[PDB]
Amino acid sequence: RQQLQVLARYLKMDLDNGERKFLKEKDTVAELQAQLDYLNAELGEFFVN
Amino acid sequence: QKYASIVGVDLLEEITKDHKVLARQQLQVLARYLKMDLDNGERKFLKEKDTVAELQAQLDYLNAELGEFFVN
């Protein structure tokens, strides 16, 4: 694990960049679901379908 | 310049690479040994960017139906 970490550092290679980008998208999903769950609360499932 | 206009005359870094290739290959075998997917992050992310696309399409439709005035 420690040897991997120094090779990653040498190659200028962020191993978390993936999980970062992902956590940031999971927030925009949460946000858009909140907008859409609201319109369902206002208009009703019958009207939206 | 009148004459010329009439007649038509006129008046290194393939070593730094080869090392970084070695380092990359060594990293890859350590990753394999530790049972450690380096793309698992970007996978999970591409899959979420699809669910965003999908929910934006649902929401862009309700705006097309009801209008921006009504939704706001």
Place this chain on the structure above:
Amino acid sequence: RQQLQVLARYLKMDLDNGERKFLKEKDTVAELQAQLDYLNAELGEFFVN
């Protein structure tokens, strides 16, 4: 073993080149023994000795 393999690749160093060259010679031996075993079959061991 895997680490050795990437160092070998980097140094442009065939680890089998030895056993190749050898298998190829063991064939030329087989071939020359077949020529010599034939002359013994024709002339006889008494005549060849």
